[PDB]
């Protein structure tokens, strides 16, 4: 009876009570955790009997701190020889009680200059501990601020879905234990007064004097100076200095950038680094996701262990210190965002047929960029037919896929229109389509692609009759009149078999095909869909209606494509007026 349950990381005394919960992290930042049992605020363990039945009776505020075991707040009450008889008198009170190892944390600096000089600075840190009235922990997670009884000065409290409760970002330890003239809550530091808002810290830390400027420049001086909660992830000098003078001047000069940098550093509430337990997405102001998380005492930003110092208290939020500039996609080049990315071979190979100049300045350009997966066995040379084409895989305006229309054309640098083709489960220009989703630039966007595109080369008839694999087609296809069809604008899909399908008709079918050309005429139309359907376009199964009637049932299976249970030998061979399929057996 009556047991509450206590949370310990491993390794540690980092412990978290609770109202007994069972909802668990199994790790906490990357520590797992062993659950005990002891005694909840109020009772007592009696010998012989299980659980915790008898009740103790209450005692006076400065009693009830060596209970919670906060002795070391208890003996410097005592020190002041003024606060000690009202924490034992009449009246309703709160008070967040430091823990001894709190105490043992001060600097030396700070525990020297208030034990030095008991009644004026010891008295004056203690009271703004305290609340004149009972507050319990249900009024304590909605995030209020509360009045202390030093000065009048706030105290800002903070809360969670996960139920931590902090106190100047404080962690609460052991909460709700009630006394004869109040309540007594421990807390995890010693906590002081907050009389400066972010703007107001920045100017002072000589650490941010290449934040402040870059603050100025916006024009955000407004909003750090006004109400409101806010968490501030500010770079240190260090950190732009990381960075390469070209780009980092680049950013600087361009008003745009700046503010989307920026934005990327602050959040939409005052987060206290004690919040954080377990991977957390967060959305910044300028719209890029970051996951929050910790790695022992070090809080880690994207796996990287980059906060240098936690829990900077200001009127209208938290400051954080980090040691790297959080640039986001939208401030970076076209370049920069994908050097390092999952197209990162395509791009050295822009850079050797020298396109590099179209990626690294400021041209509103489309760039379509086949995944590394590609190129797995080997690059292609650097000659005038790859140099051609790859001037072709750079679209003018910059654009959004999510936008594209099916009508639409784009045009690339040199001359050529090439034509978009929006299915239900995937999206593709040409024969290529995209792989995964955009990212946007400052001013270009990255397409990711799964092929390297093919751009078209003539009509139908244009490409069956450049390759003898389809001589006796080409003849069947003038027999029966279709020739001009396949010349003239168009949107095809022409399942093209080679002469070795004709090689497998069997006698009696191969001349019947030939003679009788108002029958033949019938079965080439069964052969042609009515509109574009490239490879990356089908998914799962899709039927086209071909220009007989019925419909092919064509389909997608480990990335091979099957038109009737028939495989294609070669897909996505571009037309000016369709797409040509090349396929081993003739369709019935």
Not at 268 to 275: D, L, V
Not at 395 to 424: C, M, N, P, W
Not at 474 to 492: D, K, P
Request: hydrophobic share 40%; proline share 4%.
């Amino acid at each position: 009876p009556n047991v509450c349950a206590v949370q310990k990381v491993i390794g540690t005394n980092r412990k978290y009570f609770t109202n007994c919960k069972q909802w668990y992290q199994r790790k906490i930042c990357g520590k797992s955790t062993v659950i005990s049992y002891e005694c909840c605020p109020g009772y007592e363990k009696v010998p012989g009997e299980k659980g915790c039945p008898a009740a103790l009776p209450l005692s006076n505020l400065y009693e009830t701190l060596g209970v919670v075991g906060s002795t070391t707040t208890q003996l410097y009450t005592d020190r002041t020889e003024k606060l000690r008889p009202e924490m034992e008198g009449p009246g309703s009170f709160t008070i967040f009680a430091p823990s001894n190892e709190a105490w043992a944390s001060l600097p030396a600096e700070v525990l020297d200059s208030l034990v030095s000089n008991v009644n004026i600075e010891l008295l004056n840190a203690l009271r703004y501990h305290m609340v004149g009235r009972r507050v319990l922990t249900d009024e304590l997670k909605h995030g209020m601020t509360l009045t202390s009884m030093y000065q009048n000065s706030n105290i800002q409290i903070h809360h969670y879905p996960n139920g931590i409760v902090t106190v100047n970002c404080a962690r609460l330890l052991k909460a709700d234990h009630h006394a004869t003239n109040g309540v007594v809550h421990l807390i995890d530091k010693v906590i002081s007064t907050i009389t400066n808002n972010i703007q107001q810290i920045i100017e002072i830390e000589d650490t941010f004097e290449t934040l402040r400027a870059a603050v100025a420049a916006s024009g955000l001086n407004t909003m750090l100076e006004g109400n409101g909660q806010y968490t501030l992830l500010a770079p240190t000098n260090e950190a732009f200095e990381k960075i390469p003078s070209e780009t980092l001047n680049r950013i600087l000069g361009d008003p745009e950038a700046l503010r989307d940098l920026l934005n990327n550093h602050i959040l939409k509430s005052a987060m206290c680094a004690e919040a954080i337990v377990a991977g957390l997405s967060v959305e910044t102001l300028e719209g890029t996701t970051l996951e929050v998380g910790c790695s022992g005492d070090m809080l880690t930003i994207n796996g990287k262990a980059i906060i240098s110092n936690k829990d900077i208290l200001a009127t209208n939020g938290v400051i954080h210190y980090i040691d790297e500039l959080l640039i986001p996609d939208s401030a970076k080049t076209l370049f920069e965002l994908a050097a390092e990315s999952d197209v990162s071979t395509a791009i050295d190979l822009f850079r050797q047929a020298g396109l590099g100049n179209h990626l690294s300045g400021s041209e509103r350009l489309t760039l379509l960029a086949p995944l590394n997966s590609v190129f797995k066995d080997g690059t292609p040379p650097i000659d005038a037919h790859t140099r051609n084409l790859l001037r072709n895989h750079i679209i003018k305006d910059q654009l959004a896929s999510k936008y594209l229309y099916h009508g639409q054309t784009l045009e690339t640098l040199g001359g050529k229109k090439l034509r978009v083709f929006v299915y239900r489960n995937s999206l593709c220009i040409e024969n290529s389509c995209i792989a995964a989703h955009d990212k946007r630039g400052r001013y270009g966007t990255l397409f990711t692609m799964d092929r390297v595109l093919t751009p078209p080369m003539g009509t139908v008839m244009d490409v069956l009759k450049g390759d003898n694999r389809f001589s006796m087609l080409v003849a069947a296809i003038q027999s029966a009149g279709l020739t001009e069809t396949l010349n003239r604008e168009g949107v095809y899909t022409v399942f093209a078999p080679t002469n070795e399908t004709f090689r497998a008709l069997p006698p009696r079918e191969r001349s019947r095909l030939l003679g009788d050309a108002k029958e033949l005429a019938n079965i080439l139309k069964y052969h042609i869909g009515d509109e574009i359907l490239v490879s990356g376009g089908i998914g799962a199964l899709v039927r086209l209606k071909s220009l007989q009637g019925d419909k092919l049932e064509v389909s997608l299976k480990n990335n091979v494509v099957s038109v009737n249970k028939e495989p294609v030998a070669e897909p996505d061979i571009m037309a000016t007026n369709g797409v040509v399929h090349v396929i081993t057996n003739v369709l019935q």
